Each structure stands twice: as structure tokens, then as C-alpha cells.
Amino acid sequence: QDPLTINADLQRVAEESLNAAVKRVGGVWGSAAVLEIGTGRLLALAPGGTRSVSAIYEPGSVGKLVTLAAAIDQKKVTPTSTFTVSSTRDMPNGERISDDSPHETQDMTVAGIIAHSYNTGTVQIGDTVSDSVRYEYMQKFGWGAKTGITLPSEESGILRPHTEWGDRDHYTTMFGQGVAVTTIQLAQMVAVFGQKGVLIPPRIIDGGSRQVVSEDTAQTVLNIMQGATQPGGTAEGIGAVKGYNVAAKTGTAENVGSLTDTAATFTALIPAENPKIAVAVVIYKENGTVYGSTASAPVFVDIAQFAMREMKIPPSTVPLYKYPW
Ligand SMILES: CCN1CCN(C(=O)N[C@@H](C(=O)N[C@@H](C=O)[C@@H]2N[C@@H](C(=O)O)C(C)(C)S2)c2ccccc2)C(=O)C1=O
Numbered sequence: 607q608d609p610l611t612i613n614a615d616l617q618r619v620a621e622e623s624l625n626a627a628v629k630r631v632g633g634v635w636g637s638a639a640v641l642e643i644g645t646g647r648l649l650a651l652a653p654g655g656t657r658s659v660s661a662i663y664e665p666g667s668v669g670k671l672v673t674l675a676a677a678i679d680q681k682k683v684t685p686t687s688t689f690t691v692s693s694t695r696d697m698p699n700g701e702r703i704s705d706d707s708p709h710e711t712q713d714m715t716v717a718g719i720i721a722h723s724y725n726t727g728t729v730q731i732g733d734t735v736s737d738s739v740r741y742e743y744m745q746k747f748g749w750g751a752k753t754g755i756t757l758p759s760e761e762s763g764i765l766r767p768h769t770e771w772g773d774r775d776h777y778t779t780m781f782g783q784g785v786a787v788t789t790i791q792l793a794q795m796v797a798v799f800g801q802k803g804v805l806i807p808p809r810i811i812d813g814g815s816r817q818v819v820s821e822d823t824a825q826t827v828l829n830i831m832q833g834a835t836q837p838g839g840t841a842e843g844i845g846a847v848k849g850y851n852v853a854a855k856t857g858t859a860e861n862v863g864s865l866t867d868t869a870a871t872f873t874a875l876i877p878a879e880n881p882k883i884a885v886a887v888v889i890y891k892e893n894g895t896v897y898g899s900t901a902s903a904p905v906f907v908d909i910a911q912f913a914m915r916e917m918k919i920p921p922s923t924v925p926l927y928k929y930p931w
Contacts, residue, residue: 611647611810616640616913620652623908628889631870631901636889637661637789638905639808640913641797643881646806646815648755650909651790660759662786663869663890666859666898667723669782671796671827671873673732674720676743678823682734685717685830685929695726699773703729706858718931721833723840723856725781732780740779741768746818747795748805755790755808763787782871783859793886796873799827799853800881828853832878832927841872844903847910849921851878854906856898866893870901876910879924883913 620638628636637658640650651658677683693708703725719727732740745751750765764786771779778784790808798805803824806815819827831853834841840856857871870889875881887902914921 609812611649611812612651613649613916616650616909616916617652619912620650620909621654623905624652627901627905631889631891631896632894633889633891633896633901635661636887638885638887638909639789639793640909641793641808641884643797643800643875643884644806646808647812648808648810649883649913656757656759659755659757659788659790660761662761662763662788663888664785664859664861665782665787665792665871665888666857666869667781668792668855668857668871668873668898669785670720670723670728670780671799671855672744672747673728673740673780674716674830675819675823675827676735676740677731678826679743679819680735680739683716683731685826686715688713688715689719689727689730691719691722691724691727695729697729697777699776701773701777703777715929715931717830717833717929718838720830720855721836721839721931729777729780732777737768737771737776743818744785746805746816747798748791749785749787753790753794753808756811760790761788763791782857789886789888792871792873792888793884796875796886797884799824799831800875800884828875828878829927829929831855831875833929836926836928841899841903844899845874845907847876847907847914850876850910850914851922851924851926852876853878853881856903858896858898861890863892867891868895870896870898872898872902872906874906874910876914877919877922878927879922882917882919883910885909
């Protein structure tokens with residue numbers, strides 16, 4: 607019978623979690639997409655109108671995975687390459703870049719950088735690759751284009767041609783600012799890292815795809831992503847799905863509305879040793895800041911715990927991956 611892909615129980619979990627989280631956090635709206643890994647099948651899409659597919663927003667530091675992957679794919683960097691992290695850092699082109707909150711400067715590996723999500727580290731990582739190269743990766747990950755799901759009013763996102771980026775744009779697009787995204791785009795993206803560098807176009811209809819990154823870089827981005835829940839990681843505690851290895855990335859971005867809003871974002875893969883779902887969450891607050899971790903992780907967590915039961919996936923048999931930092 608059922609020609610749609612939605613899992614009704616999973617959908618209800620999503621809507622519930624989502625609704626609660628938006629209330630909890632004083633947001634004005636939210637959205638969540640759960641994609642099955644390997645098939646591109648939508649298991650859940652909240653809030654169930656079309657806003658999930660048509661509301662666009664600057665995603666923030668979830669965009670960091672695009673730049674990380676580019677640098678790695680181009681072999682310009684490795685998990686264990688080391689850079690200096692600082693509360694601010696003045697760049698060649700006259701730009702000052704700042705971390706969320708000041709910290710003692712120190713050297714960190716790439717692994718630890720995006721794990722702590724330090725802009726000052728990632729900006730350096732992005733500088734190892736040309737803007738036209740980054741730009742091309744951004745497009746292959748599906749930014750600035752409709753995913754092509756069969757639901758009305760999909761927005762294409764905003765991805766200005768790199769040849770158009772100023773000194774600020776050079777660096778802001780490195781951590782998902784100066785770019786607009788829909789939640790469906792974000793799920794499709796992270797899905798790549800569980801798909802051996804392949805992007806599968808999402809589907810809501812079953813029935814009386816492209817290579818974005820190498821299989822190897824996908825897997826390394828996958829290992830780095832597991833650093834999110836470990837001590838010091840932005841999703842420590844809050845991102846934990848008891849008994850299951852979680853690869854994830856938070857994001858907390860400013861948006862206009864001028865520049866008074868924020869979008870708390872979360873994109874995760876689970877279970878990390880062998881991903882079965884790709885999850886993307888966003889909660890938008892209007893005159894206030896809201897953190898991907900405090901806001902959106904809990905949603906993923908509720909969804910993720912159910913999905914693992916629902917899909918009769920056994921708990922993780924192997925340790926959460928660690929690179930030294
Ligand atoms: C173009 C100017 N302009 C405006 C937008 N803006 C900005 O909002 N910066 C944010 C940012 O994007 N940094 C995060 C990326 O999300 C890093 N990752 C977060 C995470 O994942 O939790 C983090 C660990 C909380 S900080 C930020 C800073 C402080 C608090 C929350 C978010 C800039 O500063 C910036 O350049």
C-alpha cells in the first residue's frame with residue numbers, strides 16, 4: 607500500500623521533540639529531517655507543512671564540514687595537522703576572525719578544532735584551499751540547488767558565486783554564514799559522510815546520485831565528527847544517545863530577519879561506526895541567541911533513540927573514535 611517513505615511513529619517523535627524544544631527555547635519555529643542512509647528515503651520531516659523544504663537560513667558551523675571535507679579531499683590537511691587556536695585572529699586580508707568566547711591560545715589538531723568548533727582554527731584550514739575549489743565542493747554537496755524532492759515549494763537556497771565574495775565572505779562562507787540553506791539540503795549534505803562520499807537525492811515516494819568527496823575523506827570526516835560528544839566537544843552530554851556512537855556537528859549562526867536573529871543547527875549521523883540515519887535539525891529564534899547544542903541536539907537525541915529501536919539496530923559494539931587533539 608504505502609507509497610510514501612515516512613515512518614509515522616518516527617514522525618510523531620520528531621514533531622513532539624521539535625515542538626517542545628521550540629517552546630523550551632523561546633523559538634519562533636524549527637524543522638527536522640531524518641534521511642535513511644544509502645537510499646535517500648525520508649523517514650521523518652517536521653513540522654509537516656512545507657516550511658521544512660522552503661524556509662532558508664544561514665546554517666552556521668554545520669557548514670564547517672564542507673570546508674573541512676574540501677581541505678581533506680584536496681589532501682591539503684589531515685585530522686592530525688596542527689593549527690593555532692585563539693580568541694581572535696587577524697587574517698592576511700585584514701579580516702579579524704573571532705571564536706564564540708575567548709580562550710587561552712594553544713595548538714590543536716584539525717580533529718580537535720572542529721570538535722571544539724573554533725573559527726580561528728577552521729579559517730586557517732579553509733585557507734589551504736582556493737575559493738573556487740571550496741565553491742565547487744559547496745555545489746556538489748547540493749548547496750544553492752533544490753534537492754528535487756517531490757513536495758511543493760522547495761527553495762533552492764542561496765549560494766553566491768565565489769567570484770563575488772569579499773574579504774569577509776571569503777571567511778564567513780567557511781563556517782556557514784553568507785550562505786542560505788534549507789533543512790533538507792543540510793540532511794542530504796551530512797548524509798554524504800555516511801555514504802562513502804556519495805550524495806543521494808532525497809525521496810518521499812518509494813514506488814496491487816553523485817560522488818562529492820572520496821570514500822577515504824568521507825570516512826575521516828566521519829571520525830572527526832565523532833569528537834562532538836567527547837569531553838570538550840560542543841555536543842558533550844547533550845548530544846549523547848545512550849548506547850550508540852554519535853557523529854555530529856553543531857552550528858549557531860546569526861540571521862537578519864537586521865542581524866538580530868539566530869538559527870541553532872545540528873546535523874548528525876548514527877550509529878557512527880556504521881550510519882543508518884542522517885539527521886538535520888534547526889530551531890530559529892527571532893531576537894535572541896540560541897545554541898545548536900542546547901536547542902537542537904535534544905531533538906536529534908529523542909528521534910535517534912526511537913529510530914534505533916524502531917529499526918532494531920543493536921547498540922554500538924566498538925568505541926567512539928578519537929583522534930588526538
Ligand atoms: C559575518 C559576521 N558574523 C556574524 C555571525 N557570527 C557568528 O554568529 N559567529 C557564530 C559562529 O558561526 N560561530 C559558530 C558557528 O556556528 C561556532 N560553532 C558554534 C557551535 O557549533 O555551537 C559555537 C561553538 C557556538 S561558535 C557565533 C558566535 C558567537 C555565538 C554564537 C555563534 C560571527 O561571528 C560572524 O562572523
